[PDB]
Amino acid sequence: GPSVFIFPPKIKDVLMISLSPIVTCVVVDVSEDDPDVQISWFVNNVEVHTAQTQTHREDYNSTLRVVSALPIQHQDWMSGKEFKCKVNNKDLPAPIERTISKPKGSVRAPQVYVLPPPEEEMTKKQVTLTCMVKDFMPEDIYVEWTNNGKTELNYKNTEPVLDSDGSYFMYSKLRVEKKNWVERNSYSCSVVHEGLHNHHTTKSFSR
Amino acid sequence: GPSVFIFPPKIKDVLMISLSPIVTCVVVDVSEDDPDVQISWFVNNVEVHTAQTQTHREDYNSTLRVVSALPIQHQDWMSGKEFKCKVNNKDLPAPIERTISKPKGSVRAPQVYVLPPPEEEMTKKQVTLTCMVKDFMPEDIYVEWTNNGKTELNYKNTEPVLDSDGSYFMYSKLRVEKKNWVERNSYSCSVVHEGLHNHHTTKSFS
Ligand SMILES: *[C@@H]1O[C@H](CO[C@@H]2O[C@@H](C)[C@@H](O)[C@@H](O)[C@@H]2O)[C@@H](O[C@@H]2O[C@H](CO)[C@@H](O[C@@H]3O[C@H](CO[C@H]4O[C@H](CO)[C@@H](O)[C@H](O)[C@@H]4O[C@@H]4O[C@H](CO)[C@@H](O[C@@H]5O[C@H](CO)[C@H](O)[C@H](O)[C@H]5O)[C@H](O)[C@H]4NC(C)=O)[C@@H](O)[C@H](O[C@H]4O[C@H](CO)[C@@H](O)[C@H](O)[C@@H]4O[C@@H]4O[C@H](CO)[C@@H](O)[C@H](O)[C@H]4NC(C)=O)[C@@H]3O)[C@H](O)[C@H]2NC(C)=O)[C@H](O)[C@H]1NC(C)=O
Numbered sequence: 155g156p157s158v159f160i161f162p163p164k165i166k167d168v169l170m171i172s173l174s175p176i177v178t179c180v181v182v183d184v185s186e187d188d189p190d191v192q193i194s195w196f197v198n199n200v201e202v203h204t205a206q207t208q209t210h211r212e213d214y215n216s217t218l219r220v221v222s223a224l225p226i227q228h229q230d231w232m233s234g235k236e237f238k239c240k241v242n243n244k245d246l247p248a249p250i251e252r253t254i255s256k257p258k259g260s261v262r263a264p265q266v267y268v269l270p271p272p273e274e275e276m277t278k279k280q281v282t283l284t285c286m287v288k289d290f291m292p293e294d295i296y297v298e299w300t301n302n303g304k305t306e307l308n309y310k311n312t313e314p315v316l317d318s319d320g321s322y323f324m325y326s327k328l329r330v331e332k333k334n335w336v337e338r339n340s341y342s343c344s345v346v347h348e349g350l351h352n353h354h355t356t357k358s359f360s361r
Numbered sequence: 362g363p364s365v366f367i368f369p370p371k372i373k374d375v376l377m378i379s380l381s382p383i384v385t386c387v388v389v390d391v392s393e394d395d396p397d398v399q400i401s402w403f404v405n406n407v408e409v410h411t412a413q414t415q416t417h418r419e420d421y422n423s424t425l426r427v428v429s430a431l432p433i434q435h436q437d438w439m440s441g442k443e444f445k446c447k448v449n450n451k452d453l454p455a456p457i458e459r460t461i462s463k464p465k466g467s468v469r470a471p472q473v474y475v476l477p478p479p480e481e482e483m484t485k486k487q488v489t490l491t492c493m494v495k496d497f498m499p500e501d502i503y504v505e506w507t508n509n510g511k512t513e514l515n516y517k518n519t520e521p522v523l524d525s526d527g528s529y530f531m532y533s534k535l536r537v538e539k540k541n542w543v544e545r546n547s548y549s550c551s552v553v554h555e556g557l558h559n560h561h562t563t564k565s566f567s
């Protein structure tokens with residue numbers, strides 16, 4: 155029969171009041187001969203009727219996939235309410251129910267540092283700027299590099315790693331032209347995390 | 362019936378000639394009522410007879426698990442030969458065969474840099490050293506920090522990340538006593554990868 159997966163909102167979406175967090179319930183292995191799936195949503199066991207649901211074909215193996223997106227209030231996530239999807243179908247011996255909520259635990263703001271290129275790289279045409287983000291809990295975080303406020307082109311993030319004390323760390327690596335680095339630059343690391351004031355902080359090499 | 366999974370050697374083991382790389386074949390859902398499975402191993406379709414096999418109980422669900430560990434020659438893995446386990450038993454309708462080999466692809470040696478602590482930490486008793494390992498392919502790598510050659514305790518590695526040019530990078534973070542680092546400079550980053558000369562390099566602060 156079908157299988158159901160449940161997915162949280164993106165951390166940036168739930169921490170920035172201007173964005174639209176969504177909880178998503180995905181039904182896979184739905185039969186082409188029985189596409190009708192009934193999906194019911196609950197918030198702390200109260201049924202709600204606001205989800206947007208769409209069906210598509212998975213050509214890889216001739217099955218259907220149903221995607222149900224529930225728009226949520228930021229504060230319902232942050233306050234630890236439980237979101238539940240209940241999936242019914244003729245091809246199921248019982249409804250499938252999946253639940254998700256913001257895990258309850260310690261909160262510690264990240265310490266953010268920007269590191270210059272290693273000295274040995276300074277003979278190269280392109281150099282590497284590193285943003286160290288550490289000591290944070292929970293692991294959910296959003297990190298980007300920006301230049302003059304514009305979300306940067308060539309950076310890449312590591313995933314968070316569990317440190318020896320139970321906090322997490324990650325690094326963000328930015329490649330830049332050495333010319334741009336030595337000349338007046340505004341490269342900045344920007345971090346979104348629930349432990350920060352206004353859920354956001356930036357670090358830069360200069361003002 | 363049973364299911365068979367096959368696992369590669371650890372990258373450090375297969376790159377270091379002093380270590381012992383192993384290819385492992387795991388049979389799950391063996392019946393406690395019929396524990397006997399026959400496992401045969403082949404390298405480039407040549408049967409080999411050196412594997413060590415054990416059986417044990419999985420009490421979670423009253424099944425057995427059989428683990429067969431083939432000690433391999435490093436060059437067989439590195440040259441792209443296929444390793445095959447073949448699992449049989451009197452009640453299977455046909456044997457189950459699993460194969461594994463080193464993935465094909467390009468090789469790029471890592472560039473390794475050590476980064477000092479952020480200047481903000483330099484007023485603290487403990488500081489953070491960073492080893493930046495980048496531009497490598499394939500993603501299989503081993504990275505550690507050492508202190509006067511002794512493998513260090515308090516470091517943690519990121520996993521590799523796919524970079525914009527199809528190569529990989531990672532970082533390794535080590536916490537040290539500041540006094541000790543500024544005085545003795547005893548900490549170095551050691552990297553084991555296919556692309557390096559002797560499959561190894563070490564990087565120190567200058
Ligand atoms: C038929 O084919 C399909 C398709 O196959 C795939 O695609 C084709 C083209 C081929 O390439 C093929 O090789 C591929 O496999 C098969 O469908 C797949 O079925 C398997 C199940 O068999 C599914 O596997 C689960 O995947 C989960 C992860 O899914 C995400 O990530 C993968 C990539 O890593 C994506 O492919 C998926 O689409 C998912 O992506 C996420 O989707 C979210 C929802 O949209 C996104 O979030 C939303 O994003 C929007 C913006 O877009 C907004 O931001 C919203 O706010 C937000 O909500 C999200 O961004 C996106 N992420 C990414 C990274 O892209 C796994 O989580 C899951 O693992 C769990 O379950 C396993 C049991 O099945 C178990 O073994 C695991 O241990 C794990 O168990 C859980 O563990 C946690 C703890 O960690 C516990 O809490 C739980 O208790 C426990 N739960 C359970 C249930 O056990 C599965 O591995 C796969 O998702 C699915 N793919 C697709 C595309 O649908 C199908 O099976 C084939 N059928 C047959 C019969 O062969």
Ligand SMILES: *[C@@H]1O[C@H](CO[C@@H]2O[C@@H](C)[C@@H](O)[C@@H](O)[C@@H]2O)[C@@H](O[C@@H]2O[C@H](CO)[C@@H](O[C@@H]3O[C@H](CO[C@H]4O[C@H](CO)[C@@H](O)[C@H](O)[C@@H]4O[C@@H]4O[C@H](CO)[C@@H](O[C@@H]5O[C@H](CO)[C@H](O)[C@H](O)[C@H]5O)[C@H](O)[C@H]4NC(C)=O)[C@@H](O)[C@H](O[C@H]4O[C@H](CO)[C@@H](O)[C@H](O)[C@@H]4O[C@@H]4O[C@H](CO)[C@@H](O)[C@H](O)[C@H]4NC(C)=O)[C@@H]3O)[C@H](O)[C@H]2NC(C)=O)[C@H](O)[C@H]1NC(C)=O
Pocket residue numbers: 364366368369370371382383384385387389390419421422424426
């Ligand atoms: C009865 O219960 C048992 C036990 O259950 C478990 O334990 C209990 C207590 C509960 O906690 C329960 O929740 C647990 O599940 C059940 O047994 C399990 O059965 C499932 C299958 O149903 C097995 O799932 C596969 O797992 C593979 C990964 O296994 C490793 O990682 C897990 C942790 O994630 C470990 O638990 C395992 O033990 C494995 O660990 C590895 O073991 C290696 C061998 O020992 C180690 O390597 C060796 O290490 C030594 C040093 O120690 C040397 O270095 C050697 O050199 C070296 O070789 C290795 O270090 C170690 N790793 C880790 C991290 O520990 C998955 O890979 C596999 O996925 C494939 O197959 C799926 C289909 O089954 C498919 O959907 C997946 O997509 C995936 O498919 C593959 O995809 C790739 C591309 O992505 C393709 O290339 C392949 O073609 C494709 N393959 C296939 C076949 O399609 C499975 O998920 C599970 O391992 C097993 N657990 C154990 C412990 O045995 C049992 O099912 C129950 N029975 C019943 C009837 O209920």
